[PDB]
Write an enzyme that holds these catalytic residues in place. Structure first.
Site, mmCIF file in Angstrom:
data_model
loop_
_atom_site.group_PDB
_atom_site.id
_atom_site.type_symbol
_atom_site.label_atom_id
_atom_site.label_comp_id
_atom_site.label_asym_id
_atom_site.label_seq_id
_atom_site.Cartn_x
_atom_site.Cartn_y
_atom_site.Cartn_z
ATOM 1 N N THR A 159 0.812 -1.208 0.000
ATOM 2 C CA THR A 159 0.000 0.000 0.000
ATOM 3 C C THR A 159 0.850 1.265 0.000
ATOM 4 O O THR A 159 2.013 1.243 -0.388
ATOM 5 C CB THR A 159 -0.930 0.032 1.210
ATOM 6 O OG1 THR A 159 -0.146 0.047 2.409
ATOM 7 C CG2 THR A 159 -1.815 -1.202 1.221
ATOM 8 N N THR A 160 0.253 2.365 0.445
ATOM 9 C CA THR A 160 0.923 3.656 0.489
ATOM 10 C C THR A 160 0.333 4.593 1.530
ATOM 11 O O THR A 160 -0.801 5.042 1.397
ATOM 12 C CB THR A 160 0.866 4.351 -0.870
ATOM 13 O OG1 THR A 160 1.691 3.645 -1.802
ATOM 14 C CG2 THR A 160 1.330 5.784 -0.759
ATOM 15 N N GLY B 250 4.463 1.791 3.432
ATOM 16 C CA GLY B 250 3.804 1.086 2.351
ATOM 17 C C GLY B 250 4.735 0.999 1.165
ATOM 18 O O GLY B 250 5.814 1.588 1.189
ATOM 19 N N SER B 251 4.325 0.280 0.128
ATOM 20 C CA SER B 251 5.207 -0.011 -0.996
ATOM 21 C C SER B 251 5.646 1.241 -1.737
ATOM 22 O O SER B 251 6.772 1.335 -2.229
ATOM 23 C CB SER B 251 4.521 -0.939 -1.987
ATOM 24 O OG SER B 251 3.474 -0.257 -2.658
#
Ligand code: 7F1
Lengths: 189, 186, 191, 199, 191, 194, 187, 212, 191, 194
Positions: A1-2, A124-125
């Site tokens: 996620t982010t 997150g990614s």
């Protein structure tokens, strides 16, 4: 996620991508990653959905019984430190955000149980991408207009540049009281 | 992939499934597991499709070319030697039925290249499910019509009973004088 | 990798994602274009690893031009496609993956889809190799009507794309949709 | 200690209802056990549940959760809200994360308009407009995406919706090998919970 | 599975059961494990079916090349030694050489996984079902037996090996390599 | 270790790092020449290991200088990129070099050109690109502040952004970054660029 | 490591057939050509196992010791659910595919994982391919005893020839209103 | 090695000219190209001649005749067939007759240039079928393949080369073309690719079918 | 290595050879593989020596606890079942229960690696050398034999098993569990 | 990641880095407090992972503050080092924390003290020491320019040496280094130290 968070003048703020994909496939874009604990503090999960959700609810409990115990609001560093003390037994990293001091403190608790305090955490990614924008475009404290555009912007580039995160935007400026709430769809214009 | 074929009173009758699969999702509604090596001899391979299209191509042309190079109809056992020798050099089973100077011969060919002449045969996932019904009702020198109905029965059973097998069937009666194909037995 | 090939009454349509992301699906590129034209009536849409895509379309560029000049007739799709299957099979290793789609009139439309070993499916209708293929066969199996005008078939193939791209993280931006008729070719970008 | 089966159970919230359909067929790696299996269980009240993981974990998990709803309702004389049900599921599932249940799972309920909770094996639960799980999920979700949602281009008449479910699944048998031809379909309109053995 | 051979008063008497179990499921039952490398000598074989069959064809054509290059039929010892040196070069099969030779009227070679020993005044047994019968048969042994008498030993030893060894087959084939001319024998079954 | 390249109608500009770590733990060797000027109007920005990009860079250098000493015409930059494409890809998957590269050049017809490529022989034409672990950092800036029509120097301010960014939040990389700057007439380095 | 390759069970209204061969191969080769894999927990209930032996006798003694306390009487359903519950407890194991069957009529299968279910006819082990489909082919309700047993005999007929490991002769049991009958005769 | 043929002062290759003379010195065959078919014929005691025809099947479509050295025909026919097969493996379809004529022409080329070998001793006719149309190409020993509406190859064909035209006048139908072929040719063999792609040799009985 | 047992006209007759080969080198030759768990019943054992011996002592004292807790000598079936349940809980041995019981005058249980079958009207054979003799002995079998007659079968079957199995021992011990009282037998050797 | 400590009669001085890399590839998190002032006159410089040194550092902090709130006397710094020794070593080889530490302190008898320790519970008293990959760099300087009798500030010049050294030729580490400075009266930080 982010996930993204930073504090300008008027408070700490919280921003996030609602997408929650299990592998290449997308399980959901309706997912909410932002979670409130104490009435003033809140945290964002990043990484695994089940463990992060579990630890957030667990945090809500421990904080809640404490809050009942002293009949008052606990400082944010406390709520950080509890996860720092339990996670070290074992997950997924997280960010915390709240008000005890005249300025809202911000934190970030690693799955390693590493705890960090600072001004503009992200995880997150896709963290790296907004995480550039956070000093190129926010070397210092600003305004709410400037800030909601800022986070909406940095999330948008963390949405375009990273396939692992996207979906809806969801920024949450925090007042000294509680917090606000905003959600958006695509904003490429 | 079921593939069942069986000798009758003067002609081999092969029948096979028609549904390719990628492993999870199906990747085809239909395929050709009844390739025509020659007018009075066909192969019915089961296994990786790629290897099958390969060795059946190379086989078809080795056999058609060799037939052009000599008088004799390419009698069925030469295909068996060529195929088994190719697989022996190294993943695809085959079942080949042809009719010739001998009887309506039918062969089965293992992935390691092993060969066997057979009264009736099946290969693939459905093989088990086909050995069950096929063996129970078999009788040497059936009327070819009995081949017509039976081989479709054992195929349908080896269809319905596997996750890996399904779809429409096709069957053919390889008489020595002529193949008699039909595209959808179903 | 995401590629489609609908067929029509007097037409065929082919489509793709335009992203060629790298590891962890970071979008290193958004203008990548897997569809190619081997001939006015012949197209190929490659997918899987992109290196193997350029190398493969490159070799086709070679051998097809070579054959067309060596033999005056523009190559028939059955030739390009069976030859294609012949090409991949020589070595599995050459493409760590690639999933070609072949499309075009032959003026009966011809739609076929190879596997990376050269396993091949000569379909009468749509076929959809790509990393997002399950969503593709899923939408297109039921959305499909036998024969349509190029625009309704266009919105159709576009609904399979618009549907699939929003379920996969690796699906691209845009859509190089490419409806065509023997005398005409209509490429478009959809967002 | 895990085997894959394809229970292809899908949920779908209507404007005043929820719909939960599932193929009945059970299967080993490539062979069908029973032609007819219950991939869906009825939670005791206004809600029901489905799964598609290995059948031991399906059965024992539904057993456990049934024991919990029955114990809760008997201890509190009160039929649980759907939320306490799914939340309890996150509880039970995460409690065993170090050795996870293989049953990915779906909940469908009504709050009095089909509140819903589809999720992952370890309880990462989510509400949704619709849900799918089992090997048939990835294929059907786009079909469900468009028929109701029109994010890039009235959607829940009971007839039209049961139709969408029908065509979605019937198409799903075709492209998938694990999906079985039979289907149960439940319908939790506020009156009560219908069953259908449409196939 | 089982392969056996006992020399009667003059000639060899080889036997085998066919089953060709495949992956612990019978596949090609009633095959022919015993072989005609030539009329003068027959060669039982067991192990992997594919490697054995290929090797069988190979030694066959060496046997015929030798057969006509010198008009005398090749001594079976040489068939043995060529199979020795051949399988030496991985490939894997175990097998039994019986036959007639004017040089030595009856012998019975036995090739291991790689290297080959003889048993002139003995018997040769091999396969999974061998191990049951090594001890049983090496009791009943006496060199005086005629075919009418040793046919029994072959038959029974096959029956015991087949009784308690799952790989071991049903229908069994035997050859009575007579010292003289033709030596034929027909498939037979008991239990 | 970080490589960056940016095309516009007025420019191609290849900013890139100068460090060269003997041990991954330390940048013991400095001011390295990652660039390879392979043409009157085409530079090649290689990265990864120093030995791969050196052997390969010298290699491509020779095949192009050979090709140009041969036929009268200079190698058109897409032919240069694709030739580097075929060369890098020529290796069986067992052998390709660990080499990230940015072709950049000028053309008598197609003007400025840029080609982003990978350790795997993946390649594409783009308006901007990056390599190394730093690709993740500068790219959100390069995307953000990009003008398709921008004058070259405000792009130079954009690389100032990217650089001060990589310093603050990455494998810290403070030393001056050389960067060839394409013009209609010539390339224009800036080793002093900090 | 003794194993029993197959067991099958089938039912018709007047009763329920259930049979297996008596072989017990000890690896590559037969050990016990006369093993007793079918086992009688209850007058109206039996368990039939087809896997590793020791585990099977283990579960045998367990189900029996579990029974005598309850010997209304323990239903085949309760027996089956206790069985599966035991496998799945063990799992978190025993190697079998035990099926519970008895009496109106009840057949239930249990895979090694505690996977389990219930059907009119159940086959176990190698039979599933080499008998079940065939027994899926000709099965009909209200088969009389002659129809049914001739049917299962056709199935074991296909099986002994196709299964790698089977015995020529079949221990066999039929459950009837009169009481369970374990036929002695073997074939 | 050494190309045994080399150039003349006069510029000609004398050797290939010799082979031309041998073909001219060797046996006749005809080809005629009907609007809807193609017919090729040739003038072919202990010897069971039934095994021996200059006619040969390269595919279901293509058939040929040489004039010169029969063993030379044998090897050219072998490589040729192996090329129709090599092609049909390389691609999914039957070879175009023009392509096979080109590959035979290259194979004939090499020996005329490549070291150590005597040039092929024979001409070729190659009737065939393709999606383009019914075809007939003669191949020269030099490598000079050429299209023909009709042709001749063998002895005393100078006068005989000019009887073939008359079928194109108003006899483009196959059945009437037959007379053009046999009467121009006035043992024997005839292979005909008709409206159907497959071709087949007419039996001597069917040779008597047109003898009346 | 070998352990065998055949019931004569009344009682059991167990046998074994001692060798106790250790690491494919003989270490403690002329040991005692057969055992006195009690006078009423004796228990042949083979497998790992250590696990077997410990298990032997353990079942011994359970047998004695049962022996005096109820003054009747424990039925040997119970010795079998306790060894069953015991070895079930890795530990590893294979073994043979013979003995006299007033409940059942002569039986012969046989415990596998884990689970135990019987052979009331049969014989029990186990070990590496068993496999030779399963087939040989199951031929010579007849239920009428007296000890004078079956002593021969035991003796010989041991001799064949020992002939062609390297692990199999030299000196052999046998016990003639007579239906009546004492049943003793003395070590003996042949080859 | 680099830790440094130096004792003399006039001083103990613990210079150390402030960076804290989330990912090893990048120092995404900055200005971290590696030090732990555990005493009126004893600081603890931990290193390795942030979570190990945090859990362990807080831990030792509590056991010492407990021990001192208990008995009247403060914990003598060697007792502090050895107690940290026993604690870090207490873990079975399967479990010790990845934590490099420099105890440093002052004593009413033994005056200034320094204890170099390791991820493995190896420990010794020394006049100077270092941790991290940078141990290899500064140590040849710290050895070289060391005076056993040196005034504290020329030692501060020696850390200037060490630092400008680690910047030039290592995982570049430019940001200011905090460093507690022991005195007879108190510790004295310098976060501004560059
Ligand atoms: C039998 C299945 S089985 C388990 O019983 O052996 C079929 C046999 C088959 C299928 N199609 C044809 C055509 C002609 C003759 C025989 C045929 N084979 C399969 O189901 C394969 C499963 C293997 C693992 C046993 N399926 C495949 O190989 C895939 C086919 C495919 C993939 N994409 C397509 C698009 C269009 C048409 C077909 C396909 N492909 C692969 O498995 C990819 N492999 C990976 C390794 O080998 C080469 C390519």
């Amino acid at each position: 996620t982010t996930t993204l968070a930073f504090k300008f003048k008027d408070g700490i703020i919280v921003a996030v991508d609602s997408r929650a994909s299990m592998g290449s496939f997308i399980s959901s874009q309706n997912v909410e990653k932002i979670i409130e604990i104490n009435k003033n503090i809140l945290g964002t999960m990043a990484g695994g959905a089940a463990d992060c959700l579990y630890w957030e609810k667990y945090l809500g409990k421990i904080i809640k019984i404490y809050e009942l115990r002293n009949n008052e609001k606990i400082s944010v560093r406390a709520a950080s430190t509890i996860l720092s003390n339990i996670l070290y037994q074992y997950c997924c990293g997280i960010i915390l955000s709240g008000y005890d001091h005249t300025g809202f403190n911000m934190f970030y608790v690693d799955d390693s149980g590493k705890k960090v305090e600072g001004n503009l955490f992200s995880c997150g990614s896709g963290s790296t991408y907004a995480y550039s924008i956070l000093d190129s475009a926010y070397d210092y404290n600003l305004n709410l207009d400037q800030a909601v555009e800022l986070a909406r912007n940095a999330i948008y580039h963390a949405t375009f540049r990273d396939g692992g995160s996207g979906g809806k935007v969801r920024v949450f400026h925090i007042h000294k009281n509680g917090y606000d709430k905003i959600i958006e769809g695509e904003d490429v214009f | 992939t079921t593939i069942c074929g069986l000798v009758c009173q003067n002609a081999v009758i092969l029948g096979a499934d028609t549904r390719a699969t990628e492993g999870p999702i199906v990747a085809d509604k239909n395929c050709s597991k009844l390739h025509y090596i020659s007018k009075n001899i066909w192969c019915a391979g089961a296994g990786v499709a790629g290897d099958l299209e390969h060795t059946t191509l190379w086989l078809q042309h080795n056999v058609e070319l060799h037939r052009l190079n000599t008088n004799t109809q390419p009698r069925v056992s030469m295909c068996v030697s060529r195929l088994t020798q190719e697989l022996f050099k190294y993943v695809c089973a085959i079942v080949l039925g042809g009719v010739d100077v001998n009887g309506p011969q039918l062969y089965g060919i293992h992935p390691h290249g092993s060969s066997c002449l057979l009264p009736f045969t099946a290969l693939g996932s459905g093989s088990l499910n086909a050995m069950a019904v096929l063996e129970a009702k078999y009788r040497d020198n059936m009327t070819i019509e009995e081949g017509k109905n039976l081989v479709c029965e054992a195929i349908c059973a080896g269809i319905f009973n596997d996750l890996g097998s399904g779809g429409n069937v096709d069957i053919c009666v390889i008489t020595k004088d002529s193949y008699q194909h039909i595209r959808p037995y179903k | 990798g995401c590629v489609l090939g609908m067929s029509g009454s007097n037409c065929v349509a082919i489509a793709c994602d335009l992203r060629l992301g790298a590891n962890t699906f970071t979008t290193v590129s958004t203008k990548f274009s897997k569809i190619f034209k081997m001939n006015n009536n012949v197209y190929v849409g490659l997918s899987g690893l992109a290196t193997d895509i350029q190398t493969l379309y490159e070799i086709l560029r070679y051998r097809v031009n070579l054959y067309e000049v060596r033999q005056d007739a523009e190559m028939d799709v059955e030739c390009f496609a069976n030859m294609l299957s012949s090409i991949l099979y020589s070595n599995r290793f050459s493409p760590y993956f690639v999933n070609p789609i072949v499309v075009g009139f032959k003026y009966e439309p011809y739609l076929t889809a190879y596997d990376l070993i050269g396993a091949k499916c000569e379909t009468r209708d749509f076929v959809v190799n790509g990393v997002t293929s399950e969503q593709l066969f899923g939408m297109c199996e039921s959305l499909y009507v036998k024969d349509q005008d190029e625009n309704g078939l266009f919105e159709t193939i576009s609904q399979c794309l618009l549907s699939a791209l929003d379920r996969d993280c690796i699906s691209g931006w845009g859509a190089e949709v490419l409806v065509l008729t023997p005398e005409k070719i209509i490429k478009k970008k959809l967002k | 200690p895990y085997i894959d089966n394809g229970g292809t159970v899908i949920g779908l919230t209507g404007k005043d209802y929820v719909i939960l359909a599932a193929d009945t067929r059970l299967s080993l790696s490539y062979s069908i056990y029973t032609r007819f299996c219950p991939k869906i269980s009825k939670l005791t009240d206004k809600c029901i549940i489905g799964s598609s993981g290995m059948q031991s974990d399906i059965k024992t998990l539904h057993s456990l959760l049934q024991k919990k709803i029955q114990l809760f309702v008997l201890e509190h004389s009160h039929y649980p809200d759907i939320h306490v049900i799914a939340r309890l599921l996150c509880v039970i599932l995460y409690s065993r994360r170090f050795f996870p249940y293989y049953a990915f799972n779906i909940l469908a309920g009504v709050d009095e308009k089909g509140v819903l909770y589809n999720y992952d094996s370890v309880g990462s639960y989510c509400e949704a407009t619709h849900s799918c799980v089992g090997s048939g999920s990835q294929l059907i979700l786009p079909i469900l995406d468009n028929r109701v949602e029109q994010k890039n281009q009235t959607n829940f008449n009971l007839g039209d919706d049961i139709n969408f479910v029908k065509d979605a699944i019937t198409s799903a048998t075709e492209r998938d090998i694990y999906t079985g031809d039979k289907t149960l379909i439940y319908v939790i309109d506020k009156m009560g919970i219908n069953v259908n053995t449409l196939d | 599975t089982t392969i056996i051979g006992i020399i009667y008063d003059n000639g060899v008497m080889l036997a085998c059961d066919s089953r060709t179990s495949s992956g612990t499921f019978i596949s090609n039952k009633c095959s022919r494990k015993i072989n005609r490398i030539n009329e003068n000598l027959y060669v039982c074989r067991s192990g992997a079916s594919a490697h054995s069959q290929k090797i069988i064809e190979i030694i066959k054509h060496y046997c015929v090349s030798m057969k006509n290059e010198n008009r005398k039929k090749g001594r079976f010892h040489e068939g043995e030694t060529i199979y020795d040196e051949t399988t030496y070069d991985f490939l894997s099969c175990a097998l039994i050489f019986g036959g007639y030779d004017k040089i030595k009227k009856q012998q019975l070679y036995a090739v291991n996984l790689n290297g080959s020993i003889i048993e002139k005044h003995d018997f040769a047994v091999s396969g999974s079902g061998s191990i049951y019968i090594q001890s049983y048969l090496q009791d009943k042994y006496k060199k005086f037996m005629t075919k009418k008498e040793c046919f029994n030993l072959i038959l029974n030893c096959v029956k015991y090996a087949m009784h308690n060894d799952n790989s071991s087959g049903g229908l069994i084939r035997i050859v009575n390599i007579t010292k003289s001319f033709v030596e034929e024998f027909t498939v037979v079954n008991t239990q | 270790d970080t490589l960056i390249g940016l095309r516009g109608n007025n420019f191609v500009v290849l900013a890139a790092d100068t460090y060269s770590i003997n041990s991954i733990i330390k940048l013991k060797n400095d001011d390295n020449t990652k660039f390879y000027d392979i043409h009157g109007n085409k530079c090649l920005l290689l990265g990864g290991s120093i030995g791969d990009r050196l052997q390969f860079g010298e290699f491509i250098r020779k095949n192009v200088h050979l090709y140009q000493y041969q036929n009268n015409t200079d190698m058109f930059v897409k032919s240069f990129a694709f030739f580097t494409r075929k060369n890098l890809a020529y290796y069986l998957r067992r052998n390709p070099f660990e080499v990230n590269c940015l072709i950049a050049g000028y053309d008598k017809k197609d003007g400025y050109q840029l080609y982003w490529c990978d350790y795997l022989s993946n390649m594409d034409s783009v308006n901007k690109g990056a390599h190394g672990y730093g690709a993740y950092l500068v790219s959100a800036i390069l995307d953000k502040y990009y003008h398709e029509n921008l004058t070259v120097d405000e792009a130079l301010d954009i690389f100032k952004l990217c650089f001060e960014e990589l310093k603050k939040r990455f494998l810290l990389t403070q030393i001056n970054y050389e960067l060839r700057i394409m013009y209609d007439n010539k390339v224009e380095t800036q080793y002093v660029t900090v | 490591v003794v194993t029993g390759t197959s067991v099958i069970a089938i039912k018709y209204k007047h009763g329920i057939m259930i049979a297996a061969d008596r072989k017990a191969s000890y690896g590559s080769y037969a050990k016990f050509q006369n093993v007793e894999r079918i086992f009688k927990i209850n007058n109206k209930t039996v368990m039939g196992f087809s896997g590793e032996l020791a585990d099977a006798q283990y579960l045998h003694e367990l189900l029996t010791r579990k029974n005598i306390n309850n010997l209304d009487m323990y239903t085949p359903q309760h027996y089956h659910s206790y069985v599966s519950r035991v496998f799945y407890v063990r799992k978190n194991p025993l190697f079998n595919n035990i099926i519970i069957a008895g009496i109106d009529l009840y057949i239930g299968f249990v895979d090694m994982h505690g996977t389990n279910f219930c059907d009119d006819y159940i086959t176990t082990g190698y039979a599933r391919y080499f008998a079940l489909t065939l027994l899926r082919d000709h099965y009909k309700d209200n088969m009389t005893e002659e129809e049914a047993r001739i049917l299962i005999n056709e199935c074991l007929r296909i099986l002994y020839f196709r299964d790698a490991t089977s015995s020529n002769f079949i221990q066999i049991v039929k459950v009837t209103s009169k009481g369970v009958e374990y036929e002695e005769p073997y074939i | 090695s050494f190309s045994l043929t080399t150039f003349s002062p006069t510029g000609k290759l004398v050797q290939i000219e010799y082979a031309l003379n041998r073909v001219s010195s060797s046996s006749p065959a005809l080809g005629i190209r009907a609007k809807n078919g193609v017919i090729i014929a040739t003038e072919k005691e202990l010897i069971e001649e039934n095994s021996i025809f200059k006619i040969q099947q390269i595919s279901e479509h293509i058939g040929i005749v040489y004039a010169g050295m029969p063993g030379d025909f044998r090897v050219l026919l072998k490589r040729a067939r192996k090329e129709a097969i090599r092609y049909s493996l390389q691609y999914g379809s039957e070879i175009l007759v023009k392509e096979l004529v080109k590959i035979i022409a290259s194979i004939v080329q090499e020996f005329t240039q490549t070291g150590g070998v005597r040039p092929f001793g024979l001409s070729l006719l190659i009737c065939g079928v393709d999606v383009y149309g019914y075809h007939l190409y003669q191949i020269d020993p030099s490598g000079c393949y050429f299209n023909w509406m009709a042709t001749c190859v063998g002895k005393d064909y100078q006068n005989n080369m000019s009887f073939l035209e008359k079928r194109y006048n108003k006899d483009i139908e196959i059945e009437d073309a037959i007379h053009t072929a046999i009467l121009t040719l006035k043992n024997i063999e005839i292979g005909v690719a008709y409206d159907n792609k497959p071709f087949k040799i007419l039996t001597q009985n069917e040779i008597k079918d047109y003898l009346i």
